[PDB]
Amino acid sequence: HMTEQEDVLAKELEDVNKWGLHVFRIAELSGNRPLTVIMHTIFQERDLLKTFKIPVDTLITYLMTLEDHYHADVAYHNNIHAADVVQSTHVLLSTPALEAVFTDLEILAAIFASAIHDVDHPGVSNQFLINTNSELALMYNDSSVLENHHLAVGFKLLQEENCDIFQNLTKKQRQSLRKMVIDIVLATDMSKHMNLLADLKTMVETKKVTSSGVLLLDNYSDRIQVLQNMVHCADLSNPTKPLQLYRQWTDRIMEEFFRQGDRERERGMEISPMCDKHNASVEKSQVGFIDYIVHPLWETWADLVHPDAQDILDTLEDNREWYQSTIPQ
Amino acid sequence: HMTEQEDVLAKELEDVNKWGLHVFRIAELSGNRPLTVIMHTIFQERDLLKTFKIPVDTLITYLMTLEDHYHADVAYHNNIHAADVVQSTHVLLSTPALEAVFTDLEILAAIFASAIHDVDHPGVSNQFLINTNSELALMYNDSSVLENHHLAVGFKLLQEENCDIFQNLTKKQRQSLRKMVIDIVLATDMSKHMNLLADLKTMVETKKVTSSGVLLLDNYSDRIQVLQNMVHCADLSNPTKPLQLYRQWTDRIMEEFFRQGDRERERGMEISPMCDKHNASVEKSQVGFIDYIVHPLWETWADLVHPDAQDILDTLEDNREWYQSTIPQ
Ligand SMILES: CCCCOc1cc(C[C@@H]2CNC(=O)N2)ccc1OC
Ligand SMILES: CCCCOc1cc(C[C@@H]2CNC(=O)N2)ccc1OC
Numbered sequence: 320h321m322t323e324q325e326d327v328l329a330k331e332l333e334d335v336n337k338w339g340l341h342v343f344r345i346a347e348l349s350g351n352r353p354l355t356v357i358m359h360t361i362f363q364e365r366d367l368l369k370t371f372k373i374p375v376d377t378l379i380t381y382l383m384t385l386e387d388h389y390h391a392d393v394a395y396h397n398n399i400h401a402a403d404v405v406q407s408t409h410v411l412l413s414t415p416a417l418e419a420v421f422t423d424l425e426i427l428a429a430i431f432a433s434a435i436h437d438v439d440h441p442g443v444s445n446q447f448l449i450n451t452n453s454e455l456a457l458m459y460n461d462s463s464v465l466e467n468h469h470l471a472v473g474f475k476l477l478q479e480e481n482c483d484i485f486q487n488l489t490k491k492q493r494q495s496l497r498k499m500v501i502d503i504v505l506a507t508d509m510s511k512h513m514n515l516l517a518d519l520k521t522m523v524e525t526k527k528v529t530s531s532g533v534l535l536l537d538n539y540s541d542r543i544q545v546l547q548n549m550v551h552c553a554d555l556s557n558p559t560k561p562l563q564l565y566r567q568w569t570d571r572i573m574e575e576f577f578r579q580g581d582r583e584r585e586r587g588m589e590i591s592p593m594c595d596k597h598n599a600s601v602e603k604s605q606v607g608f609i610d611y612i613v614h615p616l617w618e619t620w621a622d623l624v625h626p627d628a629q630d631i632l633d634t635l636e637d638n639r640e641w642y643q644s645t646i647p648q
Numbered sequence: 649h650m651t652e653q654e655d656v657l658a659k660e661l662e663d664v665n666k667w668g669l670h671v672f673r674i675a676e677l678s679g680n681r682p683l684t685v686i687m688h689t690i691f692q693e694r695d696l697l698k699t700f701k702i703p704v705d706t707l708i709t710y711l712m713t714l715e716d717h718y719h720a721d722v723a724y725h726n727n728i729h730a731a732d733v734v735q736s737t738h739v740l741l742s743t744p745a746l747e748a749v750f751t752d753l754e755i756l757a758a759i760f761a762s763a764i765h766d767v768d769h770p771g772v773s774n775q776f777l778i779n780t781n782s783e784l785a786l787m788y789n790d791s792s793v794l795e796n797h798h799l800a801v802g803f804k805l806l807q808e809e810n811c812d813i814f815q816n817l818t819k820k821q822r823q824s825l826r827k828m829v830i831d832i833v834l835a836t837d838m839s840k841h842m843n844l845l846a847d848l849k850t851m852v853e854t855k856k857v858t859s860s861g862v863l864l865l866d867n868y869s870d871r872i873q874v875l876q877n878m879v880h881c882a883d884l885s886n887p888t889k890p891l892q893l894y895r896q897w898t899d900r901i902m903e904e905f906f907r908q909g910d911r912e913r914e915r916g917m918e919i920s921p922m923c924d925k926h927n928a929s930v931e932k933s934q935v936g937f938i939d940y941i942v943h944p945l946w947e948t949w950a951d952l953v954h955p956d957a958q959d960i961l962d963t964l965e966d967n968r969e970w971y972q973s974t975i976p977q
């Protein structure tokens with residue numbers, strides 16, 4: 320048996336409540352199982368195994384199969400990105416503006432949704448699967464193709480031998496969870512982003528708070544909408560992390576994009592924007608990504624949970640300043 | 649070779665442009681192939697084989713497989729209902745208010761959509777497939793489960809040997825058709841009906857007509873919306889047909905509903921509304937169906953194509969009066 324100083328994985332896992340968790344280091348030290356150990360740590364930390372009577376060996380067995388179904392040959396959409404979205408949602412769930420707001424079931428749904436939200440991603444976009452007449456695009460009628468697929472795989476895996484982590488939820492619990500999880504993952508579809516954000520701004524206009532700053536969320540509609548946006552912000556959280564995490568995420572999305580561009584090229588198709596290795600502006604793309612998508616979203620979020628997300632918003636403008644100012648790589 | 653007086657099938661098929669076509673008689677006389685002969689007649693009549701260079705043996709082969717994938721053990725959602733929706737859309741396409749309004753591609757899409765809109769229906773509702781945790785509900789995330797499935801089957805069958813009736817459309821034609829067909833079939837989802845109708849009323853408020861009464865439809869949005877509502881009206885056209893057709897449709901939907909109710913019963917589930925053979929009011933249900941769904945829809949349609957649908961609307965109030973007035977069966 321090892322000493323505290325020796326068990327470097329447990330040591331890193333103590334940072335699970337922090338924005339800026341060294342998730343790549345956790346991936347390396349867990350033997351490429353970041354999703355499994357991070358999910359397990361989060362479930363213990365939130366006392367979710369006890370609350371829903373999830374048997375630990377059932378949780379581990381489900382986590383392993385789910386993690387097995389992220390592709391390790393995909394540079395960005397893989398188990399490490401899933402672990403990062405899970406961990407980022409976990410931190411956002413604990414912002415003071417949201418203190419005691421969500422039930423345990425809603426917390427389960429948000430973390431479970433984050434965990435499966437990209438399962439079995441092939442490293443190519445919805446648009447590429449539509450344009451190449453893939454079996455998934457045919458199956459799903461060109462509409463939210465991957466996000467529909469992530470949901471169906473994440474639920475189906477629950478039926479494997481000893482994988483049903485929801486076996487002791489009541490029928491009604493399982494039905495509400497399912498509903499919430501579907502609503503959250505479908506909302507990760509980037510073609511939904513402009514309306515999601517437009518409607519988030521609208522609900523922030525008429526938000527109600529207790530005198531001590533806690534949000535009041537009285538109904539399903541308002542509750543689910545915060546959770547959809549929360550997970551979406553978690554998904555789009557790379558540029559708000561410490562620069563050295565951020566840069567690694569940027570190298571991985573570019574590598575994945577370039578590989579799609581190469582498939583397009585050998586298939587004789589037009590190369591999609593930002594997917595051409597011979598014609599790339601990595602830094603300018605990040606500045607555009609931040610100016611057009613990431614900052615508008617995080618500014619509205621910070622409004623919703625004011626002043627909780629101020630440091631996140633400062634880091635984001637800093638990283639934007641850095642990508643804007645650097646000498647190209 | 650037969651005489652005109654002997655070829656009773658060709659004789660019935662001359663009624664293809666009429667509301668009140670004897671579709672059950674066509675089913676019997678075609679050897680249970682109403683969808684095939686009615687689609688073929690409509691394609692010839694509209695000169696669609698020539699316009700899109702569909703080879704006749706390709707059309708027939710696709711029609712036969714598509715018709716084979718409607719279930720003959722299902723009382724209502726079967727090949728005869730598909731043939732009736734196809735034929736009813738065909739007549740609505742020819743209302744004077746819509747004279748020369750739609751391109752040939754849009755006409756193809758509406759008739760093709762009608763033809764596949766219920767393919768492989770199992771005779772049980774979306775809600776039953778969700779409640780029994782079926783593989784389709786899992787696949788499609790509880791959302792438009794059957795309508796997603798109808799689309800995916802109708803497109804997939806095109807890939808069978810000699811079934812590609814769209815082989816000579818340009819890539820861009822095939823892409824617009826696909827888009828239109830998906831938009832039309834997804835709109836047949838009854839959970840979409842209240843919003844479809846609310847939005848149809850809104851567009852009727854600001855509709856524009858030429859001085860001779862032809863609708864002006866300048867953009868995709870307005871065009872697709874009329875086609876969605878057209879096919880939806882065709883789907884919900886049973887109570888607007890001559891009484892003796894109407895009554896046969898009513899016996900078939902009740903029989904299908906009762907069979908679902910029986911599956912629910914033997915599975916020990918609660919029996920869904922109108923699915924309990926031991927507790928049914930066939931006539932009152934039709935009056936409710938007309939008052940709540942069918943008449944509100946057809947009144948708005950008749951507004952849109954005024955005065956074209958007046959006879960349809962008169963027949964509907966007549967049939968409603970009849971079901972209201974009868975001695976229970
Ligand atoms: C390609 C450069 C511009 C965009 O950058 C990024 C884009 C994303 C969104 C991904 C890409 N596809 C998605 O559906 N979600 C995430 C991280 C990124 O960089 C760190
Ligand atoms: C069950 C009696 C009340 C409803 O009657 C009818 C309902 C329909 C709509 C069908 C039923 N399900 C659907 O998705 N579309 C069609 C014909 C009917 O009667 C002639």
Ligand SMILES: [Mg+2]
Nearest residue numbers: 436437465507
């Ligand atoms: Mg995704």
Ligand SMILES: [Mg+2]
Nearest residue numbers: 765766794836
């Ligand atoms: Mg249907």
Ligand SMILES: [Zn+2]
Nearest residue numbers: 400436437554
């Ligand atoms: Zn993601």
Ligand SMILES: [Zn+2]
Nearest residue numbers: 729765766883
């Ligand atoms: Zn139908």
